[PDB]
């Protein structure tokens, strides 16, 4: 099982690489996300300011 | 050497590989969290200055 076992170990290394690579794609996206939900955060704060203005 | 000793070494190592990556991925995405909040806090702060 020595010459079955390496072949399995090579596969594990390739796998360790793909799981870490999904996270790094995730991270970039996570950064993009932060700008989108902040784009939405301004125009919801904008309608909040018109709220206490129209109240005035 | 013996088949039992090599199979014991196979499970242990491909485990080490799988675990270290899961934690590795987990650190990468934990940081992804950190940058999301810090980056949002900043970006929001500026636009809200203009709004105010």
């Amino acid at each position: 099982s020595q010459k079955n076992g390496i072949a399995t170990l090579l596969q594990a290394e390739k796998e360790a690489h793909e799981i870490v690579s999904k996270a790094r794609k995730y991270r970039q996206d996570k950064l993009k996300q932060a700008k989108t939900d902040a784009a939405k955060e301004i125009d919801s704060y904008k309608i909040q300011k018109d709220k206490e203005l129209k109240e005035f | 050497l013996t088949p039992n000793q090599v199979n014991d070494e196979l499970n242990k190592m491909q485990a080490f590989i799988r675990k270290e990556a899961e934690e590795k991925a987990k650190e990468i995405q934990l940081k992804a969290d950190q940058e999301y909040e810090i980056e949002k806090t900043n970006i929001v702060r500026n636009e809200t200055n203009n709004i105010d």
């Binding site: 076992g5 170990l9 | 050497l1 080490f16």
Partner: peptide, 20 residues
């Protein structure tokens, strides 16, 4: 027998290739 036992005992699952 010495290169095969040594790369497996330290983890680091990327085996060497020994050709003749």
């Amino acid at each position: 027998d010495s290169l095969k036992d040594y790369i497996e005992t330290l983890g680091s699952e990327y085996s060497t290739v020994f050709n003749v």
